[PDB]
Amino acid sequence: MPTLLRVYIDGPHGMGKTTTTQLLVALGSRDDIVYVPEPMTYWRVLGASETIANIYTTQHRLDQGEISAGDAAVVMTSANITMGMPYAVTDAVLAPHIGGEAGSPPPALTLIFDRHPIAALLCYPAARYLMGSMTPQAVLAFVALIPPTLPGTNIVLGALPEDRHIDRLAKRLDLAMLAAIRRVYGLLANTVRYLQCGGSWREDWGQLSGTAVPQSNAGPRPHIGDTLFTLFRAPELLAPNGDLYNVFAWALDVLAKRLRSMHVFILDYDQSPAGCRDALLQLTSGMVQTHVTTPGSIPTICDLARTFAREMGE
Amino acid sequence: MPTLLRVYIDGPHGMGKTTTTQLLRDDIVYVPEPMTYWRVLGASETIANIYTTQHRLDQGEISAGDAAVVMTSANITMGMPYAVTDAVLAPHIGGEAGSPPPALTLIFDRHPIAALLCYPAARYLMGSMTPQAVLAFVALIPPTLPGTNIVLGALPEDRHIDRLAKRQRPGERLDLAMLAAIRRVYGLLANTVRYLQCGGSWREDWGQLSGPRPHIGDTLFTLFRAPELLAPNGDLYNVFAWALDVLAKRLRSMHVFILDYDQSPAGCRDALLQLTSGMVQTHVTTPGSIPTICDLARTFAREMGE
Ligand SMILES: Cc1cn([C@H]2C[C@H](O)[C@@H](CO)O2)c(=O)[nH]c1=O
Numbered sequence: 001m002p003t004l005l006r007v008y009i010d011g012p013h014g015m016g017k018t019t020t021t022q023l024l025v026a027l028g029s030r031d032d033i034v035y036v037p038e039p040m041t042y043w044r045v046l047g048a049s050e051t052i053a054n055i056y057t058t059q060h061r062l063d064q065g066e067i068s069a070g071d072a073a074v075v076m077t078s079a080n081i082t083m084g085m086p087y088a089v090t091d092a093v094l095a096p097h098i099g100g101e102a103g104s105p106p107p108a109l110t111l112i113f114d115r116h117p118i119a120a121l122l123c124y125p126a127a128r129y130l131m132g133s134m135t136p137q138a139v140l141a142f143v144a145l146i147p148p149t150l151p152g153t154n155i156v157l158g159a160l161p162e163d164r165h166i167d168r169l170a171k172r173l174d175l176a177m178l179a180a181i182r183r184v185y186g187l188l189a190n191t192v193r194y195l196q197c198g199g200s201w202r203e204d205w206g207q208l209s210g211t212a213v214p215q216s217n218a219g220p221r222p223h224i225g226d227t228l229f230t231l232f233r234a235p236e237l238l239a240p241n242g243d244l245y246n247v248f249a250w251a252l253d254v255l256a257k258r259l260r261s262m263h264v265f266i267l268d269y270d271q272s273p274a275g276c277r278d279a280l281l282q283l284t285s286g287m288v289q290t291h292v293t294t295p296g297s298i299p300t301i302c303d304l305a306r307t308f309a310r311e312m313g314e
Numbered sequence: 315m316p317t318l319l320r321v322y323i324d325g326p327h328g329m330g331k332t333t334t335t336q337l338l339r340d341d342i343v344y345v346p347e348p349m350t351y352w353r354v355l356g357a358s359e360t361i362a363n364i365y366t367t368q369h370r371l372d373q374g375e376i377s378a379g380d381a382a383v384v385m386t387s388a389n390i391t392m393g394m395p396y397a398v399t400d401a402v403l404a405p406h407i408g409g410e411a412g413s414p415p416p417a418l419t420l421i422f423d424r425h426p427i428a429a430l431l432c433y434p435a436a437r438y439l440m441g442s443m444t445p446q447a448v449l450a451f452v453a454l455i456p457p458t459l460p461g462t463n464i465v466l467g468a469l470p471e472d473r474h475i476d477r478l479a480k481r482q483r484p485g486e487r488l489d490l491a492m493l494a495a496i497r498r499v500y501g502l503l504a505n506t507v508r509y510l511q512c513g514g515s516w517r518e519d520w521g522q523l524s525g526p527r528p529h530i531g532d533t534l535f536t537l538f539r540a541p542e543l544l545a546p547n548g549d550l551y552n553v554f555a556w557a558l559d560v561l562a563k564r565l566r567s568m569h570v571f572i573l574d575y576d577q578s579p580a581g582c583r584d585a586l587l588q589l590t591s592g593m594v595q596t597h598v599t600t601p602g603s604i605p606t607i608c609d610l611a612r613t614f615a616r617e618m619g620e
């Protein structure tokens with residue numbers, strides 16, 4: 001059976017993920033590498049009217065004190081359903097074709113995705129919770145809906161000094177949001193690593209008590225205060241005993257299950273587009289490939305990707 | 315390895331699902347309605363907010379767009395406990411056992427599809443939710459594990475209205491339009507499983523909606539013929555078509571059983587218990603899966619069901 005290499009490029013917006021990814025696709029043979037792009041058209045038209053604008057306008061309104069935190073959360077929660085739709089539908093139709101993990105000879109097909117389901121089911125929500133525009137309950141609700149992690153889930157997150165990032169981003173201008181999203185993804189990288197080194201949130205929960213003070217596949221085990229777990233020490237989720245309600249505890253259990261088997265890689269975006277491209281292309285060497293389930297899975301996957309790209313990525 | 319029997323009691327609210335499961339020490343556990351999560355843990359009085367917003371919309375006090383945001387947002391809270399529970403329980407489910415008594419029997423008050431498909435679909439028919447939001451929920455429906463036995467209810471509308479009147483939840487408003495919508499959605503749901511099990515292919519029969527199983531117009535597929543989901547030439551956009559493909563996959567392997575609720579509580583209880591004979595049991599994955607499942611159930615019940 002042919003082998004497949006799925007690679008999800010994710011991380012804070014504005015680092016050059018899109019530019020880079022296409023440079024990567026450009027180099028490959030026409031048909032042995034397909035790109036599932038950002039579904040902009042679904043966010044601006046198909047699923048709803050100008051979703052990105054509504055998000056930014058609401059955060060701005062909230063900041064100005066024109067609407068309440070509750071009003072903002074409803075809007076943000078609702079908008080996040082639209083933002084994550086295409087990732088979730090694509091994951092559900094693609095899953096059946098993924099077989100077991102083959103190994104780190106060239107893959108018959110290579111699927112480059114612009115973001116992974118967790119961007120919308122974990123990362124953006126958590127960032128919005130840090131911005132005060134989303135409840136911690138809604139965040140964990142999204143987390144509980146994260147699809148089972150299939151074998152060969154290779155994710156690439158990005159590295160970029162904040163000044164370089166601000167610069168690159170700056171052509172609404174929300175630097176607090178940029179910081180938030182930056183912290184969320186840092187935490188995420190630490191969380192996979194924490195999970196892969198044996199970290200048990202239930203065992204280290206007691207080590208959290210405090211406030212706010214990154215590698216994904218290298219280094220020692222991070223302190224739980226440096227992982228996504230710290231975010232959920234919110235008073236809304238805590239009971240009279242001081243411990244988390246089980247509903248939320250189970251959601252953190254889901255979070256750990258989902259992130260422990262993922263393969264995370266860091267791409268240094270502080271270089272030219274071609275550098276990033278050559279950079280990303282060299283990381284593919286250590287990513288895990290998987291077998292497809294049917295002999296005709298390759299073409300089906302190709303159709304899906306092209307159709308997705310044509311209908312939703314511009 | 316011990317065998318487990320999972321039974322999800324679902325259907326429109328107000329038929330007596332709860333009474334019947336209550337009436338029906340350690341070889342059968344009940345995962346109840348997570349009322350406390352809906353009223354306190356996840357958010358403040360979620361059922362009230364739902365009914366108030368439908369009522370406000372009806373009065374013309376807010377727009378259809380405003381209603382959908384609130385409705386979409388609230389549906390996240392309503393389905394949270396079912397989704398979290400499904401996610402932690404899945405790992406313990408093994409393959410099917412067969413067509414002797416099961417070591418453990420899990421009775422649930424509703425299945426993830428009530429909040430991930432049925433309520434949203436009904437609110438769409440009520441004008442308080444977009445068809446895009448509905449399919450977004452459908453796309454998140456957890457993979458259907460083996461032994462997914464779901465019991466839906468049968469009850470004449472007059473008997474239902476009559477009964478609904480008295481079991482009004484905290485914040486609920488007696489809405490007959492909403493009752494009809496939810497009744498239709500579940501009727502369609504039942505037909506859809508059957509359609510799917512008999513070979514029905516929505517892509518092949520889609521044309522009959524604009525031109526020995528049910529007709530596609532009697533399944534959930536009819537609801538997604540909404541103009542919002544179609545391109546200028548009438549075609550369903552692929553994003554939505556894929557969502558329908560997820561819907562068929564999820565519902566085809568489900569085991570649906572109809573319980574007649576037009577009878578006394580003990581009648582229903584026995585009725586339900588006689589239906590368990592044809593439900594599919596599965597093996598658990600670890601030897602210590604039973605107790606873990608028991609803990610889960612009890613803890614869920616204690617923390618969220620009152
Ligand atoms: C993926 C995703 C992106 N975004 C934002 C980041 C950028 O502003 C823009 C491009 O992805 O959208 C969200 O707000 N939510 C999401 O789930």
Ligand SMILES: Cc1cn([C@H]2C[C@H](O)[C@@H](CO)O2)c(=O)[nH]c1=O
Pocket residue numbers: 327347361364389392393424428429430433434483486
């Ligand atoms: C499960 C669920 C229930 N409900 C409502 C219907 C009834 O008011 C009550 C069910 O006991 O809650 C929703 O509005 N949405 C859902 O997803």
